[PDB]
Design an enzyme around this catalytic site. Structure first.
Site: not given
Ligand SMILES: [Mg+2]
Ligand SMILES: [Mg+2]
Ligand SMILES: [Mg+2]
Ligand SMILES: [Mg+2]
Ligand SMILES: [Mg+2]
Ligand SMILES: [Mg+2]
Ligand SMILES: [Mg+2]
Ligand SMILES: [Mg+2]
Ligand SMILES: [Mg+2]
Ligand SMILES: [Mg+2]
Ligand SMILES: [Mg+2]
Ligand SMILES: [Mg+2]
Lengths: 143, 143, 143, 143, 143, 143, 143, 143
Positions: D117, D128, D51, D114, D136, D11
């Site tokens: 993540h 995510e 988020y 914090n 790729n 972060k």
């Molecule tokens: Mg590739």
């Protein structure tokens, strides 16, 4: 960790003094397996081709002259961490700098005439092996 | 007496157990010079061709099967009295009959798996060498 | 001094042995800031393009083969005298010649597999950064 | 048990204090492999998109503001039990509640800031990772 | 004359009205080759960075606002006299002043919303291309 | 019906003959919106990964060779019934079988060199888009 | 355009009917140069190794059986666009589908017994050549 | 009457002008079978060894120089009266003296550069074949 292959050359100094067996015995005692081998007398062009990476260095001429002065034995060695393991048993390129019990310490007279060659890296090993050997020539252990 | 050449084969048993270096060292300690060498895996036809004189004998099939079971190393050895000198260091064909310090005594398990072959005479050596090597492949010592 | 930018590459050897964090930590401890970074697996053409200055050298093939053998991390480092400072923490190109505490001393196995690359000059740095990064990708520190 | 992938974000707090290397070192010491990574400065829309599930929560605005305040590093980590293992080394979300030796204990100032993540589950990890990376772009280890 | 590269941007007005294909077709009909292209939505900082030379001008804020109002397409065009040739097919910056058959004449509503950008010189083109593209991203024609 | 996304590739044949604009114009005339696009030159591994479902088919090698022979343009198209609508404007995979006015009829030379690819289903479209694009790269229309 | 190398095999059918010269003449008339060549009788293992990528396919056994049924000639061909040019003069893999003065049209009896092999791509050519030839065996034209 | 073997060499002149196939076709049309073949670039020592019978002749130096100036193709031809039959199709050593339709008449420029060599007798053929080929390399026709 992983099974690798590396090129060995017994150079003309060690061939001429009949150290081929003793050098091979050290590789095999260390757990490396000989999976291809042949005796050759390199021409000027063969040696220049193999050592093309050093073409612009000052020692190139002397290296080529020495490596074409008599027959060599070229081999493929297989085993766990074969590239670095082979390098450890060869010892330092300069024999006066080489650890005791290594091939350079026990068979090399000088920097120029240092008994044997080993591939320096996995990438170099592939190129080196492919230079002297077709994949079809390499003899995996059966039996 | 005079300089001769003889064929050596390190058989599949001795290859599989990584005795190549130790066997070669014995040849070189005895004053024999390795002037050609290559590792091969013989096909059925390659082995049958080498052993063609025994094509009609009862042991032929088993000999061929053993000699094709794994890779071998084929070599030309050069020296004074090379044929008989090679034979002396090999020892008796039957390892239980072989003198101590010979290759058969130290590396052979049985008659069938007896570690190595040597040419029995100058005449057989010429034929055997020519089977595996072109004259152009043999590397006389120049250094 | 003046604020500069230089290219870092963590080479495939150091990536494969999971040294990325430890190498980055050394840069950051020395006051260099990572302002761009990405992991890539270079194709033959990508590597040949980056190393185009060595296209005619004998080692070119092995360099390209090594630099395409696995993923790399490419980064832009920013700081006071960043080009030379980065070079000092990398240490000598040859790891056996490299000072203690440098990246080459601690993570490089050989000349060929020497863990990391750094730009050699401000001019080379501009060209090398522009090869891998658009100016729009570079993330100046706000915050 | 089974090989998984999980998303890591370093972060903006940890980036701004140059903890990227030290955090990556902890992942790698624990046996996780970095198989994709890039530094980004998220826009308002990029952060809101990532988020989106918390769009209606009271903390949403603060979270977005913090995650857009400076550059981040986004990474894919691969390994055995990678999702939970990553979570264990991150430690509790609240740094005052976090075990000693974890990333939150050692680098986080507060709940809001914090340091890092981690994906909470395999299902969240798929979503995510796909948010920040094309398939790729992910670089499996080949060496 | 000589082969050049120039930057094209299809601005948010022309993207929003789905003119991308028609604009690209005009470039290609004129013998220019698309060697890099990508769609982006510029953030405030991305647009301000591209237009940094005009940071102190009165129009800066409106330019940035327009160029961040929707996605754009950024491209590298290659060809003989590419910079000026691209400029000829774009036409005058002011669409009411632009020749018939040009992009500004056919797709631009006003000075502010004038459909597309082209680099004004070889020097500006180098800087503009490098802003949006790494050299490694550019795809020369290999067919 | 419902809004979908599908992958388009302009293949190396159509790129090399500068048909990118004309092909894009057909998509846009039919009411499909380009929401992501980039030019890439695929490596062997990139192409093999995309076409992994055909890995055991006889044409696989030729497909990969063709799709790596020059740069392509990869795009995400959005619209009502986008998957089938895109397929209708592409026409039959075999250009000799393709309806007049379709992309295959007007730009394809043969089955192998058939100008463009389109996703065959919604499920394949999700996988194909995710292969080349992170969700964060896709640019929704905001004006 | 660029000079390439490709593997040729004259298969056992064409060898047995003494078509080697006529096939070679077609290569040379088309401007391909023979830079390495040797006659071999492949063992089961040699053929299985060359065709290893098709080990799980239904035709594997029949292919191996045919390619070991008699001696072959293996060659390296060099020239402009050598891979595709070689393919054009070979003609379609299926002789009933093959164009008129091609090798398959004129010398092949069936799919199985189709006279000759050619590498399908530059990448396959590198691997195929390296299978049968050491780099040191290939004889570039001097003279 | 009886099946014989003879050595053929396609000399560097005929190789360099790509006459290998046409020359081989003539041998095969005449009922000679190619049972071994390989392309080689002879070293000075290889050529001197083959031509050792002429070591004291005045032309030896020029012969060696010509036969090492480029690659050659060495072959074993088998058939009825192969030695003399091969000689008849070669024609007179001097091409201006050679019958029409022979290899020397159609491909030789001069005495020195006379396209090809053939063994002069059964005895010379045995020695010449054994010089370049191990018996193991020769591939009898099966099939
Ligand atoms: Mg590739
Ligand atoms: Mg090296
Ligand atoms: Mg083999
Ligand atoms: Mg020789
Ligand atoms: Mg420099
Ligand atoms: Mg930016
Ligand atoms: Mg205004
Ligand atoms: Mg590139
Ligand atoms: Mg599908
Ligand atoms: Mg976004
Ligand atoms: Mg060579
Ligand atoms: Mg044989």
């Amino acid at each position: 960790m992983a099974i690798e292959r590396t090129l060995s050359i017994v150079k003309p100094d060690a061939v001429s003094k009949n150290h081929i067996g003793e050098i091979f015995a050290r590789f095999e005692k260390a757990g490396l397996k000989i999976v291809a081998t042949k005796m050759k007398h390199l021409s000027q062009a063969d040696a220049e081709g193999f050592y093309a990476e050093h073409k612009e260095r000052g020692f190139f001429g002397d290296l080529v002259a020495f490596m074409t002065s008599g027959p060599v034995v070229v081999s493929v060695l297989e085993g766990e961490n074969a590239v670095l393991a082979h390098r450890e048993i060869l010892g330092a390129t300069n024999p006066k700098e080489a650890a005791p019990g290594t091939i350079r310490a026990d068979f090399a007279v000088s920097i120029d005439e240092n008994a044997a060659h080993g591939s320096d890296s996995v990438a170099s090993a592939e190129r080196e092996i492919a230079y002297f050997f077709a994949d079809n020539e390499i003899c995996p252990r059966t039996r």
